Structures are given as C-alpha cells and as structure tokens.
C-alpha cells in the first residue's frame, strides 16, 4: 500500500524558515526518487527539485536554488525540504511526489500537499458588513472581512435559513482573509421578516450577528 | 526556460473520445521529454496517469493513453467517464528541469449545462466609514465550472484591484465563485457605474450597479 504523508498546514512568520516533511511507506524508499512541487491555488504547478534518497543527490530548479533545501533521512523513510527567508509570497501548497526513475518514468504517487501560510498577522476577528441589494427570489449576503486565522463559521438566522446558502472560499489579502456568504429568500420574507448572518471566528472567540437592513 | 502549453478547458460527454495536447515552446516534444500526465481531482488529490510519454501508471484505467501527435505529447481518454472530470497537467523534461503546463480543466457532462446566477452588491454603508468600499460579485450554480469575470468601472475594463475565487464544487455538482472589487471610500464616490461581467460557456451575464 503506497503512501506519502505530509502534514496538512504550517503557519510561519515572514523571515523564518520551515522544514516540511514527506514520510514514505509501502515501498523501498531508495528505489524511487522523490520530488517537491509548488502550487499557488489557481496558477499552476512549479517543480522545486528532486532528491535521490539513496545517495542524497539533488537537482534543483534554478529558480529555487537559494530558497529550497532537499534532504532525506533513510532510517525513517522521510524526505524533507527546508524553505528559507520566507515571505508572504511563499504561501502555497507544497506536494511531494515519487518518481519512478529506474522504471517507467512517472510521478505515480503524490502527497496530499502541505499548505504553508506565511503571515505576520495576529489573531484578528472579522468585521462583518451587511450585503443588501439595490433595485421572484432575493439574494442577500454578508462580507466577513479581514480576519485571521482561518476559519470563520457563517450561519443565517442561527440556522433556520439553511437552504440556498452559499459560503465562498476565502482570499488572503495583505496577511488577512476575506469571505462572503449569501442566502436567497422569498421576496415576501424580505424585508418584512429580518435576516441576520451569524459570523463566528473561533481563534478570537468572536460572535457577530448582523441584521441585513434594506438600503 | 521552456514553456508548456495546454488547452484551458474542454468539455465532452460520457462515452466520448477526447484528446488533451501539450506543446513545448522550443520545438517538438520528443521521447526525450518523458512527457508525464497528472490528474488533480478536488481536495488537492494528485494521481500520475502517464509517465515516459506512454507508460500507463498502475491502476490507471485503460481508457487513458499517452502518445505524440506531431510535435506535441497527447493524452487521449477513450470513452470518457464522469469520474474523469478534473484538471490534467502535463510535464516535460528539459535535460535537467521539469516544466508543467497550465492545466486543462476537463468537464465530462454528468448533467445539463447551467447558467450562472450573478449578484453584485455595492459597498455597504458601514464600510465607506472605513474609507474603504468593496464591491461583491457572487456567482453560483454554473456548469461547466469555468467562468470569466470582468469588472467595468465607468465603462473601462478594470485591470486592478479585482480578486476572483477559484470555482468550488457545490453539493449539487455545480460551481460557485466570487469576485471582489476593492476601492477606496474615495474612488467609489469619484465614479458612476460598476459592472460585473461573467462569461460562461459562450453567454455573458452583466450585473450593473448604478451608484
Ligand atoms: O526519468 C528520466 O529519465 C528523466 C530524468 C532524468 C534525470 C533526472 O535527474 C530526472 N529527475 O526527475 O530528476 C529525470
């Protein structure tokens, strides 16, 4: 049963370094090469370099030569990669993939990738802003802007409005995240009966409720 | 120092035969580029399909095959299945570097296409007070899950300050995405009309806000 294990997430401050890990199991560690890859959500994969767990030899992407360091620990079957002088820009997901160099030449098995977040931001609670229209069914929303870390929980009318609710993924903007949620309600219920979005941000023990008033 | 190109998105139906291509900017792709095919399925799930131009990774259905068609590497899915709906990247080797293409989003229609439902909300009032104004453009229920969002502030394409989420799979198997246009309490007041334009499988929906 081949498996490559990577931690799910790391959080480091800009200026520091991180040692990411990739622990192999299910095959002879040394008969396959190990590769590291960077993925910026939605911009593509970039090869960082590869290591031969046998001899410890590496080949790097000239672009990463001074940013990445590949190493291997034969006894514990883990490949590691250090990243130095981190900055907000290094935030991405880093995968480890196995390469059948001696065989058929494919990156057959991959790690689940590790999401690195480099941020200088402290635990900060979101500021929720009502999203009312301006003109059958009507959509309402609420903006959960500038919070850190992840995640926030958004609910409508404490859960009664559980259908036709969309909570979008967050975008990391200048070390702080932003998210949105919208709910679709009969045009009769609104603005007659009120709609409140309940944002909860655990890291900062926050609970904000905002009634969406027409305007 | 080479650039790998793939089609952006393609759509097929179960049972069909489709071919993804991989071009190199420096010449023909040859067996020395050891073309690799990788699949990304939702939840950051990678699987290698083809290695060495044409070696099918073990446990990869036989409907997947790799080859060279002229000057490019190609992946042909013979009898596409709905499970085949994912992102496919190709990688080429250049003596000592690997270069990955941009990915091809393959959609294998497991349900009828669906037009997005676009919503634009102006900066809320309590926000201008921060001397900041964020315009929100909400787009849900579309399929295939590939759209193009364009903002138009006073009639001129806005080519900065706009951030767009990558489509996320809803539970119905349709997608949603959201675009934000962040301005200054200032910029907001200085302009007249805001527009969020979403292009989806050839048709365009335009949500306009009239400050
Ligand atoms: O598999 C092959 O022949 C291509 C190849 C050759 C040399 C390498 O160093 C390498 N890699 O991935 O590091 C891959």
């Amino acid at each position: 049963q081949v498996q490559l294990q990577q931690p799910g997430a790391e959080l480091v401050k800009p200026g520091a370094s991180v040692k990411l890990s990739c622990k192999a199991s299910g095959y002879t560690f040394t008969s396959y090469w190990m590769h590291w890859v960077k993925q910026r959500p939605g911009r593509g994969l970039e090869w960082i370099g590869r290591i031969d767990p046998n001899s410890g030899g590496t080949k790097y992407n000239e672009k990463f030569k001074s940013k990445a360091t590949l190493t291997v620990d034969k006894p514990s079957s883990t490949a590691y990669m250090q990243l130095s002088s981190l900055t907000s820009e290094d935030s991405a997901v880093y995968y480890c993939a196995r390469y059948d160099y001696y065989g058929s030449s494919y990156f057959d098995y991959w790690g689940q990738g590790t999401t690195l977040t480099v941020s200088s931001a402290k635990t900060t609670p979101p500021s929720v802003y009502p999203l009312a229209p301006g003109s059958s069914m009507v959509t309402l929303g609420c903006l959960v802007k500038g919070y850190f870390p992840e995640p926030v929980t958004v609910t409508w009318n404490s859960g009664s409005l559980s259908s036709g609710v969309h909570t979008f993924p967050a975008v990391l903007q200048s070390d702080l995240y932003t998210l949105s949620s919208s709910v679709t309600v009969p045009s009769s219920p609104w603005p007659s009966e009120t709609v409140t979005c309940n944002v909860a941000h655990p890291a900062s023990s926050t609970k904000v409720d905002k009634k969406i008033v027409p305007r | 120092q080479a650039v790998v190109t793939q089609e952006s998105a393609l759509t097929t139906s179960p049972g069909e035969t489709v071919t993804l291509t991989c071009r190199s900017s420096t010449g023909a792709v040859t067996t020395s580029n050891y073309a690799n095919w990788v699949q990304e399925k939702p939840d950051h799930l990678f699987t290698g399909l083809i290695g060495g131009t044409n070696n099918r990774a073990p446990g990869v259905p036989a409907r997947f095959s790799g080859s060279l068609i002229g000057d490019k590497a190609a992946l042909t899915i013979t009898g596409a299945q709905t499970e085949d709906e994912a992102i496919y990247f190709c990688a080429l080797w250049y003596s000592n570097h690997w270069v990955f293409g941009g990915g091809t989003k393959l959609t294998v229609l497991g349900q009828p296409k669906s037009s997005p439902s676009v919503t634009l909300f102006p900066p809320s009032s309590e926000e201008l007070e921060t001397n900041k104004a964020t315009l929100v453009c909400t787009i849900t229920d579309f399929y295939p899950g590939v759209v193009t969002v364009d903002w138009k502030v006073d009639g001129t394409p806005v080519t900065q300050g706009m951030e767009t989420t990558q489509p996320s799979k809803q539970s119905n198997n349709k997608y949603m995405a959201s675009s934000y246009l962040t301005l200054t309490a200032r910029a907001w007041e200085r302009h007249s009309s805001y527009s969020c334009q979403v292009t989806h499988e050839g048709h365009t929906v335009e949500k306009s806000l009239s400050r």
Side-chain angles (χ1 to χ4, degrees), chain A residues 35 39 45 47 61-62 95 99 104-108 110 112 129-131 139 145 166 168-169 171 179-180 210, chain B residues 36 40 44 46 48 51-52 55 57-58 97-98 100 121 124 126-127 130 134 136 140 165 170 176-178 180:
Chain A
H35 288 75
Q39 179 171 56
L45 292 184
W47 188 59
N61 169 336
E62 281 276 353
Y95 304 94
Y99 184 71
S104 310
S105 291
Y106 38 48
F107 291 96
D108 59 3
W110 290 60
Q112 94 198 87
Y129 302 116
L131 286 211
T139 308
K145 158 192 197 178
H166 295 99
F168 307 87
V171 297
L179 160 171
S180 280
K210 289 228 46 136
Chain B
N36 258 265
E40 179 183 342
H44 287 331
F46 283 84
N55 308 310
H97 269 73
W98 285 84
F100 276 97
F121 311 89
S124 80
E126 343 189 346
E127 201 198 2
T130 60
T134 309
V136 187
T140 69
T165 276
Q170 312 180 164
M176 35 153 134
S178 54
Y180 302 103

Side-chain angles (χ1 to χ4, degrees), chain A residues 33 35 47 50-51 59 99-102 104-107, chain B residues 32 34 93 95-96 98:
Chain A
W33 282 8
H35 288 75
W47 188 59
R50 72 100 174 127
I51 193 152
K59 274 207 176 99
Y99 184 71
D100 186 14
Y101 172 72
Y102 297 111
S104 310
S105 291
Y106 38 48
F107 291 96
Chain B
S32 323
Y34 292 96
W93 176 247
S95 322
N96 55 189
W98 285 84

